Every structure is written in structure tokens, then in C-alpha cells.
Amino acid sequence: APPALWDLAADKQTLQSEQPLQVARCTKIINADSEDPKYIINVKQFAKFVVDLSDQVAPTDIEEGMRVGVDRNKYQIHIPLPPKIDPTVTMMQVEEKPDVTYSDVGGCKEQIEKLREVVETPLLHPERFVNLGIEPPKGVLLFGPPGTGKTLCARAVANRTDACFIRVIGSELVQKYVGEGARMVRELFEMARTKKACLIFFDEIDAIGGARFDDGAGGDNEVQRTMLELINQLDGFDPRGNIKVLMATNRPDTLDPALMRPGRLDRKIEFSLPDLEGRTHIFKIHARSMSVERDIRFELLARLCPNSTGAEIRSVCTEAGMFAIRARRKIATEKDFLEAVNKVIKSYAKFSATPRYMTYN
Amino acid sequence: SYDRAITVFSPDGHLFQVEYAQEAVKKGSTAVGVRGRDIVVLGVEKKSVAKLQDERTVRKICALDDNVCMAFAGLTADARIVINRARVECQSHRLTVEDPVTVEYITRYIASLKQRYTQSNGRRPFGISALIVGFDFDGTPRLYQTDPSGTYHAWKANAIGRGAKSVREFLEKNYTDEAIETDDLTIKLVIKALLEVVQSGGKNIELAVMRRDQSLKILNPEEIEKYVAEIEKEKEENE
Numbered sequence: 001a002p003p004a005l006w007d008l009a010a011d012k013q014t015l016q017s018e019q020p021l022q023v024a025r026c027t028k029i030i031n032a033d034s035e036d037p038k039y040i041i042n043v044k045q046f047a048k049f050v051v052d053l054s055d056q057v058a059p060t061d062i063e064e065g066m067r068v069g070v071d072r073n074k075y076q077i078h079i080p081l082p083p084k085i086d087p088t089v090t091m092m093q094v095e096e097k098p099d100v101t102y103s104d105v106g107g108c109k110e111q112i113e114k115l116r117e118v119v120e121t122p123l124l125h126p127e128r129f130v131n132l133g134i135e136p137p138k139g140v141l142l143f144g145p146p147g148t149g150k151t152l153c154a155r156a157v158a159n160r161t162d163a164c165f166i167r168v169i170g171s172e173l174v175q176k177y178v179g180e181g182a183r184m185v186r187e188l189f190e191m192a193r194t195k196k197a198c199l200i201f202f203d204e205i206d207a208i209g210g211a212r213f214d215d216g217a218g219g220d221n222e223v224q225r226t227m228l229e230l231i232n233q234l235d236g237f238d239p240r241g242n243i244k245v246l247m248a249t250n251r252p253d254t255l256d257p258a259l260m261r262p263g264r265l266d267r268k269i270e271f272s273l274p275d276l277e278g279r280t281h282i283f284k285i286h287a288r289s290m291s292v293e294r295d296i297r298f299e300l301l302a303r304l305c306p307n308s309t310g311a312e313i314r315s316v317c318t319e320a321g322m323f324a325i326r327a328r329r330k331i332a333t334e335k336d337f338l339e340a341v342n343k344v345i346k347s348y349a350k351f352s353a354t355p356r357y358m359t360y361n
Numbered sequence: 362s363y364d365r366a367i368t369v370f371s372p373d374g375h376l377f378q379v380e381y382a383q384e385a386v387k388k389g390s391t392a393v394g395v396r397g398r399d400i401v402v403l404g405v406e407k408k409s410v411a412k413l414q415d416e417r418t419v420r421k422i423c424a425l426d427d428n429v430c431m432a433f434a435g436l437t438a439d440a441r442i443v444i445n446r447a448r449v450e451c452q453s454h455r456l457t458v459e460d461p462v463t464v465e466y467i468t469r470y471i472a473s474l475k476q477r478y479t480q481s482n483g484r485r486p487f488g489i490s491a492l493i494v495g496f497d498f499d500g501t502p503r504l505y506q507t508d509p510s511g512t513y514h515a516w517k518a519n520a521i522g523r524g525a526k527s528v529r530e531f532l533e534k535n536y537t538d539e540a541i542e543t544d545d546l547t548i549k550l551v552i553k554a555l556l557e558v559v560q561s562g563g564k565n566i567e568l569a570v571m572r573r574d575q576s577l578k579i580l581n582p583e584e585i586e587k588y589v590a591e592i593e594k595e596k597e598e599n600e
């Protein structure tokens with residue numbers, strides 16, 4: 001209440017400052033200009049208003065499609081308001097704060113290296129690649145076995161140099177509203193160019209990328225709104241973009257978005273996935289988990305779990321501590337959990353052996 | 362939709378119709394068996410006898426010869442196929458070269474025949490397995506197994522079916538090296554596993570013992586009825 005006392009007591013200066021700008025209702029878009037003084041403007045009341053502008057604002061600052069203030073009495077232009085947009089749709093689009101730093105990598109070197117130089121390196125040293133130009137590529141792509149998905153995008157969040165970047169997923173842009181995706185991708189780059197340093201990311205393009213055409217009834221044609229328009233908006237020249245966006249998905253499908261990207265995008269890499277000598281790297285970050293006995297050999301259990309990435313062997317050190325408390329013991333020796341690891345691979349392969357070959361085949 | 366392959370097999374590291382046929386093995390009727398210097402014992406359970414039907418039609422053990430006994434776990438459909446098949450095989454073997462090959466010819470017959478049975482097109486692999494019972498020449502025991510992949514292997518103990526039948530083979534490892542020096546306790550192991558395995562009904566349990574070169578006969582409810590009483594007495598001697 002003491003913080004709310006002086007807080008509520010400030011209305012004396014408020015009502016004095018409430019009289020000015022009170023008439024700003026409502027936000028109105030202009031249309032065209034025949035001469036300098038008079039412009040036609042349209043407001044959400046559905047009523048269009050021709051008016052001149054107050055002497056406090058220069059006429060050159062009024063551009064076609066600019067929402068500006070108003071005086072409901074005189075209808076004259078008051079103050080411009082930068083945002084034209086957008087109802088909702090921002091809260092799931094905007095992503096802030098870091099997490100998942102670079103130390104979480106599972107040993108992949110050349111993979112994470114060449115996708116680091118497409119984003120982090122150009123922005124950290126802009127003069128480098130400009131003098132070294134040539135020209136940076138227009139985009140990237142990610143897909144393969146699930147490990148490691150969606151984490152590599154989280155890697156750039158904690159490695160972000162200055163300002164947070166935008167995350168977008170496909171299913172949030174579904175309709176209901178059609179045309180937001182166009183309007184969205186246009187404004188985020190216009191918002192970008194001011195401060196630059198804002199990445200655009202899209203996830204799960206496979207579901208929304210259904211190609212190409214069917215007899216009827218569509219069907220895929222309403223899905224063509226998502227795939228074709230997004231690629232088309234990516235296909236612009238501006239610039240395009242400064243952050244060179246990003247792409248991530250599950251399967252390479254479909255053919256049409258896959259044949260469109262080589263004309264624009266670049267750097268298509270296939271997971272990778274652990275190397276036989278790289279499975280111990282995910283065990284290195286897990287070697288700091290709980291208390292690890294020095295007799296444990298990570299090279300021994302690595303070969304026993306093929307195609308386990310970092311997700312399935314994350315359960316190894318989990319089942320380690322899992323059965324540790326079940327048995328009331330404290331640490332977990334190699335032979336302890338690996339006896340359960342040979343079970344966790346086979347018993348979980350009874351219903352599905354987790355192949356990815358059958359997905360695209 | 363339905364996306365799957367058949368043969369062979371899958372990049373995921375495991376076959377399809379083979380290790381999946383092992384599910385049709387482990388789901389088979391619970392059966393056990395042991396080897397000995399003189400009398401070899403076997404067993405079968407989980408036949409779901411309703412007491413109202415005839416026991417000889419559900420019999421799970423046949424004999425190609427008096428020397429070699431057949432024990433299989435799985436459906437009884439493909440059984441008579443193999444019964445007709447293998448009996449003619451051991452017959453044509455009896456025909457020329459009267460002295461038969463010892464234990465390495467017959468165990469590799471069904472095994473290799475089942476391996477090529479997964480080889481050529483238009484041949485669906487069997488989802489059943491089998492374990493050969495009998496006695497090798499010169500007083501030695503013989504036992505082996507059949508695998509969906511066709512790999513023949515010899516076991517010191519026969520444990521299949523549910524987890525309750527695996528305890529019967531666990532009790533054999535508790536007899537160490539010396540036991541048993543009497544055939545009474547070796548038969549009683551089946552009478553003790555009768556309570557552990559299945560529903561403990563005292564009905565589906567059936568066994569036969571072959572002492573040396575003497576052809577075995579199915580146990581009548583007299584001997585096995587007397588050895589069933591000592592099974593509970595021998596467990597009470599350990600208390």
C-alpha cells in the first residue's frame with residue numbers, strides 16, 4: 001500500500017496532462033495525397049477523413065499508410081504512431097532471454113561449425129564478410145534423425161550476441177486468419193532493419209509443406225497457402241534477409257519446397273547423429289551429473305546403443321540415477337546401469353526399433 | 362496408413378519376421394527340461410486343460426525314435442507338418458547307412474531347413490521353436506534347441522514361456538555339480554515346478570524320463586504321484 005500510495009496520488013498531474021492527447025481516438029490510416037496540405041485518412045470508425053496536419057508536425061513525415069493521431073473536434077493530424085499492427089499473434093512469435101549455451105553440444109564439430117559461421121560470425125564481424133565478399137548465403141536448413149533437433153536453435157539463444165531473436169512455428173499461423181504470415185514476415189524485417197540483429201526461425205515445415213496437387217477435393221491446395229507463400233516471401237531480395245533466417249524440420253518432404261531452396265537458400269546438412277567415437281561427448285557433459293565413478297568407461301557402452309543420439313543415452317545416466325535411488329545406493333558404476341541399458345535399448349525396441357528409414361520410405 | 366517391410370529387414374538393426382517370431386515363441390506353452398547321466402527329465406504346462414477333453418490330443422511331446430525325443434513350444438498346427446516331415450527324415454536316415462549319425466545330423470536338419478525356409482520366396486518363417494531331448498551314445502545325454510534364425514545350440518537348462526518356468530531352471534543351478542545322485546529328487550524338481558509354473562493345477566503337468574538306452578514311457582499317476590508327495594516333503598526338509 002505505501003508503494004501504491006504515491007502511485008495513486010499522481011493523478012493530480014495526470015488529469016492536467018490528460019486533457020492533451022485525449023482526442024487521439026482513434027488510430028487512422030491515410031490513403032493518398034493530391035496536394036501538400038490535405039491528405040485523405042481512414043479510421044476504424046469506418047469513416048474516412050480528409051484533413052490537413054497541425055503546424056507541430058512537418059508534412060514530409062506523413063507517408064502513405066501511416067497511422068497518426070487525431071483531434072476528434074478538428075480531425076487534424078496530431079502525432080504519428082509507429083505500430084500499425086498486429087492483433088495478438090505477437091506473444092507466441094516473440095522470444096526472449098537465453099538458455100542452452102554452446103557447452104550442450106554432443107561432439108559434432110563440422111556440423112555446428114559451418115552453421116555457426118552462417119549467423120554468429122557475420123553479425124559479430126560485419127566488416128569481415130563484407131570485405132571478404134563474395135556474399136553471405138540467403139538461408140540454411142536442418143533435418144535428419146531427431147537428435148539433435150530444436151536444441152541447435154536453442155544454442156543460438158544463449159550464444160546470442162546482442163538482441164533476442166524471433167521464433168515462429170507452423171501450427172500457430174494456421175487459419176482462421178489468412179494473410180497474417182505475409183503481413184508478419186514483412187513487418188518483422190521492417191522492424192529488423194531499424195535495429196537489425198533479429199533472426200527469423202520457422203519450425204516443422206513438413207506438415208504445412210504438403211505438395212503438390214491432387215484431383216479433389218483440396219486438400220493440399222489450402223496447405224499451399226503456408227508453403228508457397230512463405231517460400232515466396234523468403235524469395236525476396238531484401239536483403240534477404242540481413243540475418244539470413246533459418247530452417248528446421250523433420251523429413252526432407254516435400255519436393256517443391258526442397259527444389260525451391262537451392263535457388264535461394266544454401267547449407268543443407270544431414271544429421272549427424274553421433275559418431276562411434278562421439279557418443280562419449282554426450283557422456284562428458286553427463287560425467288558432471290551426480291557422482292560418477294572413475295572406473296566407468298564411456299567407450300564401452302557407446303557401441304552397445306546404436307543411433308541413440310543424445311536423447312536415448314540421456315536416459316542411460318538417468319536410468320543410472322533412477323535405479324540408484326531404487327536400490328538406495330548413491331553412485332552408479334558402469335556395470336550397474338549398462339545392465340539396464342542393454343534392456344532399455346531392446347525392451348523399447350519391441351514395439352518400435354525407432355527406424356527413420358521408414359519415415360520417408 | 363500401414364508402412365512396413367518384410368524380408369529383409371530394416372536399417373534399425375533388428376530383423377522383422379525373425380525376432381517377431383520370437384514373440385510367438387515366448388508366448389508358447391510353458392515347458393522345461395534337464396539333462397542327466399542316466400535319466401533325462403522334461404516337462405510341459407500351460408495347456409489350459411478344462412478336464413472335459415482328451416489329454417492325448419493335446420500331447421506336446423512326440424518321438425522320432427526311442428533314442429531321440431521331440432519337445433517343441435508353439436502352436437500345434439505346424440507341429441504335425443514337422444512331425445510328418447522330420448519322421449520321414451529320420452526314416453530315410455534309418456533306410457540307408459543303418460548306423461545313424463550322432464546328434465549332429467538331426468539337429469542341423471530342422472535348423473537348416475528352417476533357415477532356408479526363411480530364404481526362398483513364397484516361404485513364411487515358422488513362429489515356433491523346439492528343443493531336442495534324448496541321450497547320446499555311450500551313456501551321454503543329448504539336448505539342443507531350434508532358433509527362428511536356424512542356429513542350433515545346446516543348453517544346460519531349458520527355460521522358456523513365462524517367468525515362472527524360468528525358476529525351474531534356476532533351481533537346477535542350485536543343485537550344483539553333484540546333485541542329484543538319486544532319480545527321485547530329479548523327478549521331484551518337475552513336481553516342485555508344478556506349483557511355481559502356470560496355475561498350479563496338477564493337471565497340465567506331464568513328464569517322461571529316459572534312463573540310459575531304455576525307451577521312456579509317459580508317467581502314469583502312480584510313480585509321479587508318489588514323487589509329487591516327496592516334492593513337498595523335500596522342500597520341508599530345508600526348513
Ligand SMILES: Nc1ncnc2c1ncn2[C@@H]1O[C@H](COP(=O)(O)OP(=O)(O)OP(=O)(O)O)[C@@H](O)[C@H]1O
Nearest residue numbers: 104105106146147148149150151249250309310311
Ligand atoms: N548429440 C547431442 N548432443 C546434445 N543433445 C542431444 C544430442 N542428440 C540428441 N540430443 C537431445 O535429444 C533431445 C530430443 O530431440 P528431439 O526429438 O526434440 O529432436 P526434434 O526437434 O524432434 O528433431 P526434428 O525437428 O528433426 O524432428 C533434444 O532436446 C536434444 O537436446
